[PDB]
Amino acid sequence: GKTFFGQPLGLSTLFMTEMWERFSYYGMRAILLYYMWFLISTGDLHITRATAASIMAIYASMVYLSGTIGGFVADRIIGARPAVFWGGVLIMLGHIVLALPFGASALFGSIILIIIGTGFLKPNVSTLVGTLYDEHDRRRDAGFSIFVFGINLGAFIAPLIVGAAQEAAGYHVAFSLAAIGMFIGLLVYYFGGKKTLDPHYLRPTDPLAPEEVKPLLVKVSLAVAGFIAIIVVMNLVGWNSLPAYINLLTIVAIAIPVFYFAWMISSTEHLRVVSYIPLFIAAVLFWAIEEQGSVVLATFAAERVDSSWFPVSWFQSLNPLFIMLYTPFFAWLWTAWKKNQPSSPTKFAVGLMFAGLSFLLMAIPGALYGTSGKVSPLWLVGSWALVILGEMLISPVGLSVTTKLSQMMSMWFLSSSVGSALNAQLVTLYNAKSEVAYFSYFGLGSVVLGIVLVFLSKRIQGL
Numbered sequence: 001g002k003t004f005f006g007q008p009l010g011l012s013t014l015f016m017t018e019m020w021e022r023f024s025y026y027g028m029r030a031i032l033l034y035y036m037w038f039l040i041s042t043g044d045l046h047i048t049r050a051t052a053a054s055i056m057a058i059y060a061s062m063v064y065l066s067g068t069i070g071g072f073v074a075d076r077i078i079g080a081r082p083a084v085f086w087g088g089v090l091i092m093l094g095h096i097v098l099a100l101p102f103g104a105s106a107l108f109g110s111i112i113l114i115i116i117g118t119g120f121l122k123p124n125v126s127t128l129v130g131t132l133y134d135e136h137d138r139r140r141d142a143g144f145s146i147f148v149f150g151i152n153l154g155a156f157i158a159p160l161i162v163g164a165a166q167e168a169a170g171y172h173v174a175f176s177l178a179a180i181g182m183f184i185g186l187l188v189y190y191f192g193g194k195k196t197l198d199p200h201y202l203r204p205t206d207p208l209a210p211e212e213v214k215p216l217l218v219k220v221s222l223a224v225a226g227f228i229a230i231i232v233v234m235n236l237v238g239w240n241s242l243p244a245y246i247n248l249l250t251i252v253a254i255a256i257p258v259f260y261f262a263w264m265i266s267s268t269e270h271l272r273v274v275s276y277i278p279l280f281i282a283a284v285l286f287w288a289i290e291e292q293g294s295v296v297l298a299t300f301a302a303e304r305v306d307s308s309w310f311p312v313s314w315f316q317s318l319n320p321l322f323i324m325l326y327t328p329f330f331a332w333l334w335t336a337w338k339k340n341q342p343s344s345p346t347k348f349a350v351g352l353m354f355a356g357l358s359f360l361l362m363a364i365p366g367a368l369y370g371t372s373g374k375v376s377p378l379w380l381v382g383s384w385a386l387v388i389l390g391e392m393l394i395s396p397v398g399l400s401v402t403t404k405l406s407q408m409m410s411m412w413f414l415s416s417s418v419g420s421a422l423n424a425q426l427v428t429l430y431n432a433k434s435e436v437a438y439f440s441y442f443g444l445g446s447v448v449l450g451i452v453l454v455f456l457s458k459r460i461q462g463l
């Protein structure tokens with residue numbers, strides 16, 4: 001009878017929970033770079049714009065990385081439903097910290113809170129969506145598709161609302177709106193959740209057995225002690241600038257999948273794991289380019305686009321806008337394409353090519369008009385139109401192609417973390433002087449690697 005778009009009613013709760021969480025997150029993302037520019041311009045924040053850009057990327061990287069851990073903590077320690085709640089509380093506090101009358105000094109506290117908060121919430125709202133369905137329920141795919149629509153919806157309206165708020169009432173109010181967004185999500189989640197969510201998920205579904213507590217404790221302790229020792233050594237030898245710490249985080253984010261690889265490849269469907277390397281690298285490079293929209297394209301939008309009549313942060317709405325527009329088309333395409341459907345390796349290859357084209361496109365206005373002037377918003381619209389076209393190919397089959405080849409599964413989600421970590425290095429190269437070369441180089445490079453993957457496509461599809 002009564003459903004939410006054909007799904008169990010409980011989906012409406014999780015849909016809105018995540019919509020408002022994504023609202024809070026992408027509302028923040030859409031103005032945080034500009035906020036750091038502002039803090040720099042007033043002499044409050046003593047970093048370069050390049051470093052500010054690097055912060056944005058490594059921020060995203062750590063958020064993605066944190067998300068690969070929150071599932072474990074919920075499933076084994078605190079439960080999925082408390083994970084989402086307290087995750088949301090931390091996210092909200094993270095935005096509240098930026099709304100307070102502080103400047104640069106509040107940035108780190110905010111970043112940590114949201115990293116931890118999102119890590120708790122993001123994987124576990126997804127988990128709770130699954131719990132709405134029996135094993136044999138054919139609606140599961142549809143329900144997640146609707147769930148993802150809620151994600152994109154929140155990502156879409158946030159830059160519009162928060163960005164406008166920022167320009168009208170300043171950054172603190174804008175960040176307060178992101179906080180309020182999360183609060184709304186928490187209200188709907190908490191009271192909505194009590195009614196439709198299985199009480200089972202108030203507790204861990206796979207709680208630590210007695211003999212598991214100490215080994216986990218030792219693991220975490222060694223990791224923290226090791227990380228801290230590195231920071232001590234870094235400060236002793238004078239590698240203690242912010243870019244230095246960002247490099248450390250870059251190294252950590254990249255080393256984690258490198259080590260899982262070295263593990264699996266060393267430890268015979270070995271051949272299959274080897275086949276994932278080009279797919280994973282393709283995913284990483286795609287996510288790198290896609291995640292640069294909130295950094296390099298946001299920079300381009302503010303410095304190089306004639307946007308005198310609307311908030312420049314609004315460009316951040318194009319990414320989720322195009323996902324939502326493309327989605328029913330690609331949904332149709334993959335069912336209608338019965339004969340000769342492309343392989344997932346081919347989708348990755350073509351997906352990366354489109355990402356490459358999105359940057360190659362952005363090289364044109366600077367090459368044609370020079371970089372001193374300002375250009376139409378349509379250049380960015382076209383760029384996002386292209387990279388999202390790439391996303392429609394890689395994103396829906398990403399988890400899929402990885403699975404058909406638990407550690408390796410997290411690596412799919414890690415590819416975006418690695419992509420953002422790569423960005424933390426790359427985006428420091430972007431400026432007005434390097435603009436055309438930046439877009440050309442990384443655009444062409446991605447296309448070439450898309451072509452390389454096309455050549456490799458047949459091998460991979462057999463394994």
Ligand SMILES: CCCCCCC/C=C/CCCCCC(=O)OC[C@@H](O)CO
Nearest residue numbers: 329361376378379381382383385386389
């Ligand atoms: C399902 C079909 C996929 C097709 C969607 C991909 C759309 C790609 C568009 C890229 C071209 C955008 C460049 C437009 C542009 O820069 O014009 C600026 C100039 O006209 C200033 O007025």
Ligand SMILES: CCCCCCC/C=C\CCCCCC(=O)OC[C@H](O)CO
Nearest residue numbers: 055059062065066104107108111115242
């Ligand atoms: C639980 C795994 C997730 C990884 C957690 C580690 C995250 C640690 C630090 C976040 C790094 C953010 C760097 C940006 C940053 O420091 O900006 C602060 C400004 O420099 C303030 O002066």
Ligand SMILES: CCCCCCC/C=C\CCCCCC(=O)OC[C@H](O)CO
Nearest residue numbers: 081082083085089189190193194197202
């Ligand atoms: C630090 C200020 C934040 C204060 C948070 C509110 C504290 C009041 C009650 C604690 C709420 C604990 C509920 C945890 C939880 O699992 O919520 C899930 C709901 O049952 C819906 O699934």
Ligand SMILES: CCCCCCC/C=C\CCCCCC(=O)OC[C@H](O)CO
Nearest residue numbers: 096099100169170172173176179180183
């Ligand atoms: C129960 C948790 C509360 C969740 C709501 C958090 C946000 C609520 C109020 C914050 C709004 C006021 C902060 C913005 C502000 O004061 O601006 C300061 C001046 O405009 C200086 O720029």
Ligand SMILES: CCCCCCC/C=C\CCCCCC(=O)OC[C@H](O)CO
Nearest residue numbers: 069073077207208209210213216217220
């Ligand atoms: C950075 C996140 C990585 C995972 C964090 C784990 C938290 C640190 C150490 C593990 C402590 C877990 C508490 C054990 C617990 O509460 O349950 C005990 C068992 O359920 C009873 O046998």
Ligand SMILES: CCCCCCC/C=C\CCCCCC(=O)OC[C@H](O)CO
Nearest residue numbers: 210213214216217218220221222224225
């Ligand atoms: C600040 C990070 C430090 C890194 C190590 C984190 C250690 C944090 C908490 C250790 C929790 C102690 C484990 C024992 C425990 O909680 O189990 C109790 C049982 O559930 C009672 O039967």
Ligand SMILES: CCCCCCC/C=C\CCCCCC(=O)OC[C@H](O)CO
Nearest residue numbers: 108112116231240241242243245246249
């Ligand atoms: C459960 C609490 C988690 C505590 C945070 C864990 C990660 C802490 C630090 C990661 C390293 C990032 C340091 C960034 C930073 O502020 O350094 C900038 C310095 O001012 C260098 O001039």
Ligand SMILES: CCCCCCC/C=C\CCCCCC(=O)OC[C@H](O)CO
Nearest residue numbers: 230239241243244247248251252255256
């Ligand atoms: C899953 C295992 C994780 C492995 C982490 C190993 C990280 C060990 C050392 C990282 C070195 C720290 C980087 C510091 C650095 O690059 O300095 C930056 C500049 O040269 C100083 O301005």
Ligand SMILES: CCCCCCC/C=C\CCCCCC(=O)OC[C@H](O)CO
Nearest residue numbers: 310314315316317318321376377378381
């Ligand atoms: C009416 C379009 C459907 C709703 C779009 C949502 C708004 C999200 C981003 C729009 C901000 C950047 C677009 C600006 C634009 O396209 O203007 C083109 C004109 O030629 C300006 O010279």
Ligand SMILES: CCCCCCC/C=C\CCCCCC(=O)OC[C@H](O)CO
Nearest residue numbers: 360361362364365368376378379382385
């Ligand atoms: C459903 C139609 C889909 C068409 C999408 C394919 C787009 C093909 C080429 C993109 C054009 C490259 C940028 C446009 C360009 O260079 O012209 C320069 C500006 O028009 C100068 O005013």
Ligand SMILES: CCCCCCC/C=C\CCCCCC(=O)OC[C@H](O)CO
Nearest residue numbers: 357358360361363364366367436437440
């Ligand atoms: C299907 C739509 C295709 C849209 C993207 C197609 C763009 C293809 C090639 C654009 C590459 C632009 C090169 C610009 C360039 O590097 O010239 C340098 C000039 O000397 C200015 O520094």
Ligand SMILES: CCCCCCC/C=C\CCCCCC(=O)OC[C@H](O)CO
Nearest residue numbers: 448451452453454455456457458459460
């Ligand atoms: C400017 C001179 C160099 C220009 C290089 C252009 C050649 C680049 C790519 C050739 C792509 C040919 C497509 C054939 C191909 O990839 O086969 C697909 C595989 O058989 C499927 O795995």
Ligand code: NA
Nearest residue numbers: 307308310312
């Ligand atoms: Na503007």
